[PDB]
Amino acid sequence: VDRGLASANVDFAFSLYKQLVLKAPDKNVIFSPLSISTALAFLSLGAHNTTLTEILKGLKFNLTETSEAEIHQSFQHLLRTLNQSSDELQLSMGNAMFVKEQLSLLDRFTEDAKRLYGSEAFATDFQDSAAAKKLINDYVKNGTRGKITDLIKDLDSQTMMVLVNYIFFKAKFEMPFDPQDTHQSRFYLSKKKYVMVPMMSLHHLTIPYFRDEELSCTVVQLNTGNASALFILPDQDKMEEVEAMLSQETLSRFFDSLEFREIGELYLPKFSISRDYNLNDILLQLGIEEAFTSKADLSGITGARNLAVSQVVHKAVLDVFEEGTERSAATALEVLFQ
Template structure:
């Protein structure tokens, strides 16, 4: 019986706010760009594959819980899986890479790892307007002898720290790992690892922490409680933030029956908010594809918005992704047939679990600090003619995109802002 490699895809992802970019468009066209910097080509291929993986995973999670909130970081999950693939061989490797939406005949394995290496470095560049940190770690049983090549590549390509861990004492190991994650996410992601199997010999971890402020914050005095419609018959009262008389990138997609706006944050990122028409959520979700996102971003046009209403909310998730990833084609790694011989040199390891925990907190300032709910009384607008009013008062989608790397860092669905 192989030992257990508990792949703690500590997709310990915290997003107390959302990302922002200056309103550019995604451009994943990498053909006929011989004059491009090779690193740029790596980045574009990676961004496209990561988007494909993000939407595939989203659709799988949404199909299992169609009326529930969803929040996860596809970037963190894909990075952890790519990190794992360093030690995978044969069918196990092919399944992981294919599950990540790469084709080894088009993109060699070395190029995939190089792409993630460049991505991690790009995300780690100092930005005084945006707090974004990501990293990897290995928690290893002392008796487990890792191949020197694996350790060196883990450090070079994924900047992975290695920590000796006493898995024979599960409570101590859990405390050690969870303390590391809590510290790296500034106290927001806690208890990522639970009920640890004492047979575990290694856990791979990836974390992401993001914090930013809205470029133009909402005024707390303009937040008031109003209805958020869960469906045609049910609604809940939620704190609704409001902004009036603003110019925003906007697009109404007649083909997919949805409306979207891009909200900017200080720093190098933006939030794309997608509001399906009533009864059209499933149809929009079914068409979540990299090509759809490219079309949306390319169609955004800055226009005058008379009023924008957005719920103030904090949602979190904790997923065991084993079954979901298996349905996406990553199966052998979870079986006794797993070939992770690149880690130790022997086929003695298998993946026992892939866990992911994420938190998304959106408030007036864009930080996790909660502001008191107020009631706003304002005069009736004296403007003549039709007004453009966008109310996110029913289930909507959110995608958080890092501009420089064109990477979807977080994606989610707000089905009920009251449910954490």
């Protein structure tokens, strides 16, 4: 079960990554694969037939290796681990459904949604579009502690439901950078194109390290957790080559080959990046198609085939600074009547 979930998880994340890159290969990318898959798995609690199997297969699950109940139990357990507080990290993760006030939901669905995904149901007047957008955007703003502010830009006044996930991940560096040692330095977009950025620096530090000569890249860890950050640094003009090798096989080789090593100097930029996306094109390419058409079967939500997905949107933010890092993301799945 676990190795089956792991294979699905990595395959979904890297498949999504490459599709995001394909739309604009030179842009910064920041996203949360788990936020997106959690929203879709939550949706699948109410799906049936081809609509259900397409969602679960689009998340790269094999339903003969891992049952539906085993998939939802994995999400439930994970969601619980992503709500933690300590002097080294703050983690939050939440799900919600915003539902047209009069709309009847099956008890099985609202029971499953609360138990497995932690989701409440918020009665919402979508016909007052500005107020409904503020309600949802405020929920995400609260959950991401101000970092994701405008997840919903446009919202159909005839919306029936919006399923929302957010994730917040703030982590202190075990060895913080001293801001006195941050100085403007070149960042090479390519061998011949470069800008000046504030570059943090540390001397004489012992971190997990792997020089991968076959892939022309260096892999390190900054930071002790149950989910530590891996940094992958391709040699100049080898990013495309490294991206082409991303796989479960390559990731496990990276992790298995890390060794503690004394590093003379480490330079890392101080920066923030943000991206937002509409994921309809990509989810259709992953084979999640019936959920978007009038053949959609979401009758596990309401007792009738009277709902279909209209829009899936995602926004994510990454902040890197001397004391540590902050990451946040949110996903909204918008649903119309049929």
